[PDB]
Amino acid sequence: GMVDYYEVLGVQRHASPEDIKKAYRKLALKWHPDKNPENKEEAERKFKQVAEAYEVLSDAKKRDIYDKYGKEGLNGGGGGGSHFDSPFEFGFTFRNPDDVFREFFGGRDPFSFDFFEDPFEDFFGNRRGPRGGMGNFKSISTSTKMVNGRKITTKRIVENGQERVEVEEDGQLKSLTINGKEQLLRLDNK
């Protein structure tokens, strides 16, 4: 009948490889972890499914199998009674969906721009930019002590060459300094 991966892509069984590429790219954005983190439940599940769907469905070796079977799947060739040459299952494991998207996109929004959607030009940091960026951290020094029953924690965080000191008391930020310039926390109403 049809291959379930088509339903994952949201297309018809007669969709071309190029149309598979379309759905793949579109859904890569649509259900991207950073696109819809609010519904991470539906997003994660479908996002990962898209990885599998694309990789397998787009494989000519699997298409050969599907053509033999008639898109029947379970023992399709036997049920249909077909006689075509096809590749065999050799105990192949499942691939990390994240690695799939890493290969083809880099784990990033397919429809993003390096000149317009610059991660390092984002006040809020909703483009995988600095301020919590992986590989951007040089070194973090953490030291905690007890003062009059109070938990005093000081963190020296170096990121992108910039140093910021964070001093907390019982889990509450008391002082914050950036490159020797103390910032006023009263301005932070987030």
What is d(CA 161, CA 141) in angstroms, rounded to the nearest whole number? Answer: 14
Identify the helix (H) or strand (E) that includes residue 174.
strand 172-178
Q: Widest CA span of the chain, in angstroms? A: 83
Among residues 57, 55, 41, 42, the alpha carbon closest in space to that of 7 is found at 57
Q: What's the sign of the alpha-carbon dihedral 63, 68, 71, 77?
A: negative
Among residues 150, 157, 142, the alpha carbon closest in space to that of 174 is found at 150
What is d(CA 27, CA 126) in angstroms, rounded to the nearest whole number? Answer: 19
Q: Report DSSP letters for 3-19, one per residue.
A: -HHHHHHT--TT--HHH
Count CA within 13 A, CB hemisphere, residue 153: 13
Neighbours of 51 (CB within 10 A): 24
DSSP 146: E
What is d(CA 143, CA 167) in angstroms, rounded to the nearest whole number? Answer: 10
Neighbours of 145 (CB within 10 A): 9
Quick check: 140 and 155 in contact, CB under 8 A?
yes
Report the side by side order of strands in the sheet with 150-159: 137-147, 150-159, 162-169, 172-178, 181-182
What is d(CA 116, CA 114) in angstroms, rounded to the nearest whole number? Answer: 6
CA dihedral defined by 67, 73, 77, 78, rounded to 10 degrees? -170
Domain residue extents for the chain:
1-116, 117-190
Q: List, in sequence order, every residue forming a beta bridge with 182; answer none if it has no partner.
A: 177
The residue whose two tokens read 């069984």 is 13
